[PDB]
């Protein structure tokens, strides 16, 4: 009622897109790509129809790649901070399930990890550390869309419809510009082809940008000035988004 006026005020303006983009991750400095990359996960496709038949996707996926110190993790922490229904794991230590259910034995089911965040954004650091075992499970999540669970007891099927935001370090933690990205990320082909798209970042030295980084970081570690502020407040952007979710584009 009182707020809907604000919502209207948001949809009216022609810049509020740009406002969104610039206001997403204050902590992070620039890059402008992964801003959009992060937000466009929160707002997903129709994920419905086309029957008869098999259902379209729907949702979205992203895997951020880059030389460390690029603060690729700050995004992550910002997402687990900002949006509800978001799980954060650092796996390598997943360890296994983890991302799936035990099941507890009875036939009561553990949450857990991945699936307890549903219709949402799950954020995993370092795909490259979890080796073979679980990655396959994730593939089973992003292919069949369902999580099938049978252990020494009651057989089961549990749905998880989720977006997966990963941060994956390169083979040598570096480029390798000359190498094919296909060869660089070092995760298996089928899970690779389901992530669209990667939004790779590499940081290279530019004295303007360098000065801006040192300035900005020292700024951050200063209680003053913390006056740096986004055009949208972190609280309102949620009710805005949730409003924008009720549309069937």
Q: Is 231 annotated as a binding residue?
A: no
Handedness of CA 28, 167, 76, 41 (dihedral sign): positive
- Encode burial over 162-191: b for 16+ CB neighbours within 10 A, e otherwise: bbbbbbbbbeeeebeeeeeeeebbebeeeb
Stretch that binds another protein, among 36-44, 46-54, 181-189, 204-212 (CB under 8 A): 181-189
Stretch that binds another protein, among 39-47, 89-97, 159-167, 177-185 (CB under 8 A): 177-185
Q: How far is CA 83 from CA 74, 107, 173, in A?
A: 14, 31, 29
Whether residue 39 has a cis bond before it, omega within 30° of 0? no
Q: Does 177 bind another protein (CB under 8 A)?
A: no
**Cα distance between residue 28 and residue 100, in whole Å:** 32
- Which DSSP helix (H) or strand (E) runs through 61? strand 61-65
Hey, which residues does 170 pair with through a beta bridge? none
**Cα distance between residue 117 and residue 130, in whole Å:** 20
CB of 179 to another protein, least distance (A): 6
Residues 19-48 that bind another protein (CB under 8 A): none
For 160, phi then psi, to 5°, come to: -135, 115
CB of 186 to another protein, least distance (A): 9
Nearer to another protein, 75 or 127 (CB): 127
Stretch that binds another protein, among 5-13, 23-31, 120-128, 174-182 (CB under 8 A): 174-182
Q: Single out the residue of 2, 50, 51, 183 in contact with another protein (rule: CB under 8 A).
A: 183
Nearer to another protein, 69 or 180 (CB): 180
Q: Is 73 annotated as a binding residue?
A: yes
Q: Single out the residue of 182, 223, 224, 248 in contact with another protein (rule: CB under 8 A).
A: 182
Stretch that binds another protein, among 17-25, 176-184, 207-215, 231-239 (CB under 8 A): 176-184
Q: Residues annotated as binding site? A: 66-73
Q: Residues annotated as binding site for ATP? A: 66-73
């Amino acid at each position: 009622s009182d707020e809907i006026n604000e919502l209207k005020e948001m949809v009216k303006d022609e810049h509020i897109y740009d406002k969104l983009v610039r206001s997403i991750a204050p902590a992070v400095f620039g890059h402008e790509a992964v801003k959009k990359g992060i937000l466009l996960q929160m707002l997903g496709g129709v994920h419905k129809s086309t029957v008869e038949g098999i259902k379209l996707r729907g949702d979205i996926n992203i895997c951020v790649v880059g030389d460390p110190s690029t603060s690729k993790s700050q995004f992550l922490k910002y997402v687990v901070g900002f949006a509800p229904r978001s799980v954060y794991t650092s796996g390598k230590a997943s360890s296994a399930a983890g991302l799936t259910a035990a099941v507890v034995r009875d036939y009561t089911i553990e949450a857990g990890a991945l699936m307890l965040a549903d219709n949402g954004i799950c954020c995993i650091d370092e795909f490259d550390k979890m080796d073979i075992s679980d990655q396959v499970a994730i593939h089973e999540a992003m292919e069949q869309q369902t999580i099938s669970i049978a252990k020494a007891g009651i057989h089961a099927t549990l749905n998880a419809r989720t977006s997966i935001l990963a941060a994956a370090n390169p083979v040598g933690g570096r480029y390798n510009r000359k190498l094919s990205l296909r060869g660089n990320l070092n995760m298996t082909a089928p899970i690779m082809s389901r992530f669209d798209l990667f939004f790779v970042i590499l940081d290279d030295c530019n004295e303007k940008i360098d000065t801006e980084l040192a300035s900005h970081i020292v700024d951050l570690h200063m209680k003053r000035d913390e006056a740096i502020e986004p055009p949208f407040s972190a609280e309102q952007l949620r009710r805005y988004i949730k409003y924008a979710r009720t549309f069937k584009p």
